[PDB]
Design a binder for this molecule. Structure first.
Ligand code: NAG
Length: 450
């Protein structure tokens, strides 16, 4: 009940890798069937694979024509990965997809990642004449991250997010700004420490007020998302990294997708700290997580068997790095990633992961009422042909279906299935009146004269 009110989300990496509208509709059908509430669609994540009809941008006193932005982005994406299946979703396809999901009671949550995982936008910005948009660390240039000290590149990124946010306004509820790295490829995976370093180790060439600037950046993206009536979300990585609250405060309306509890040399804030600060927590435990193409034990980290085992061993309420506290959650999210985007997407592998997550946490997931609705529509129309006793039993069985609690969980699916089987039995039991019997035999007789 309070369990049923939680979000249950599947995440799909359609930033690195192309997914067709047909493929996503199939994912949505499964999400509805298994009792999920939302599809989390990354469209900006290395690649940028969603294109508005109007891509014109004004940023920091400069104007960029819609057609030039489209060309620049399309090519920037292909420079990351030129996917044989496609390049991007169009605005018509996205609007249709969102409507499709909405008719099935399923929400859509887009991600456009920054300041990291934004290769395609960085490439596009170069083509559009913005100089040095990428962060560089003592001569090593990030392929994925924007330099927060480059005002023009920051202004362009923000203007692009604002344009996506304008489109998603009213059609969606939540917008994921990501915030999940800062130049890990250029700093030996220590981007957050690099941003914090100059405060504790001055005059050594570390980015001046780096982490302070990241906070302002996060907060301004949150302001932008909210100005469009949407809720901002981000991954947990950089939010009070090293539990350091001394650089400033993150906007507490930022919903945190808590995917990692960190590891040796990667010291993220505990979910305990984030919850105490007042951030809502979406449990996105990487115990559940799955990388396309890594389909069985032995094929590397986050293979499908590993994800399945994680789902068995880590319930939806089990959040990374709790430090022993009871962490309240708004929901849970299982994630499929496309780290090697040329890997073949296998729908059946994904659905297995989704089904197991639903089954392991059945009291949280919605029951499936679709077969019940179908059973009702399939009751014969011509009931006057049948015995009063047999018709009354059918009517009773229909009523029992219509009076089922509309808020059953997946754990209570049997209740619905028994009502369906009972209706079918009563329909099977429909018995012709003597008058209908005579008419039917008269009709078989003429039909034989053919
Ligand atoms: C911030 C971060 O590194 N997120 C990573 C994502 O980019 C990657 O696709 C996935 C599987 O390897 O692990 C995620 O959580």
């Amino acid at each position: 009940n309070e369990k049923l009110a939680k979000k249950k989300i599947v995440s799909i990496d359609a930033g690195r890798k192309y997914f067709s509208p047909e493929q996503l509709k199939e994912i949505i059908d499964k999400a509805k069937h298994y009792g999920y509430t939302d599809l989390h669609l990354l469209v900006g994540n290395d690649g940028l694979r969603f294109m508005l009809d109007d891509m014109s941008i004004t940023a920091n006193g400069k104007t960029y024509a819609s057609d030039d932005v489209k060309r620049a982005i399309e090519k920037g994406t292909n420079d990351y990965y030129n996917d044989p299946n496609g390049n991007h979703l169009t605005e018509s396809q996205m609007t249709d997809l969102i409507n499709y999901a909405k008719d099935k009671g399923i929400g859509l949550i887009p991600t456009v990642n920054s300041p990291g995982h934004m290769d395609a936008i960085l490439n596009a910005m170069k083509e559009l004449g913005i100089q040095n948009p990428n962060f560089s660390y003592f001569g090593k240039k990030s392929a994925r991250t924007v330099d927060l000290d480059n005002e023009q590149a920051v202004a362009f990124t923000k203007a692009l997010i604002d344009k996506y946010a304008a489109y998603f306004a009213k059609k969606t509820e939540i917008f994921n700004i990501g915030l999940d790295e800062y130049a890990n490829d250029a700093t030996d995976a220590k981007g957050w420490s690099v941003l914090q370093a100059d405060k504790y180790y001055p005059n050594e060439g570390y980015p001046v007020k780096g982490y302070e600037k990241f906070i302002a950046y996060a907060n301004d993206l949150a302001r932008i998302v909210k100005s469009h009536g949407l809720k901002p979300m981000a991954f947990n990585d950089g939010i009070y990294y090293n539990s350091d609250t001394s650089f400033g405060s993150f906007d507490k309306d930022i919903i945190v997708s808590m995917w990692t509890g960190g590891w040796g040399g990667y010291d993220v804030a505990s979910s305990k700290l984030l919850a105490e600060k007042g951030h809502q927590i979406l449990n996105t435990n990487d115990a559940w997580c799955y990388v396309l193409g890594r389909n069985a034990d032995g094929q590397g980290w986050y293979n499908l068997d590993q994800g399945l085992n994680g789902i068995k061993n880590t319930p939806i309420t089990s959040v990374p790095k709790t430090e022993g506290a009871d962490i309240p959650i708004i929901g849970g999210m299982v994630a499929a990633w496309a780290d090697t985007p040329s890997a073949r997407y296998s729908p059946s592998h994904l659905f297995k992961l989704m089904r197991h997550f639903a089954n392991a946490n059945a009291e949280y997931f919605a029951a499936d009422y679709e077969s019940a609705e179908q059973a009702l529509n399939e009751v014969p129309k011509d009931l006057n042909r049948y015995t009063a006793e047999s018709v009354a039993a059918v009517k009773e069985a229909e009523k029992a279906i219509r009076s089922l609690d509309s808020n059953l969980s997946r754990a209570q699916q049997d209740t619905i299935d028994q009502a369906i089987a009972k209706l079918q039995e009563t329909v099977n039991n429909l018995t012709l009146t003597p008058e209908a019997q005579k008419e039917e035999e008269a009709k078989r007789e003429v039909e034989k004269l053919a």
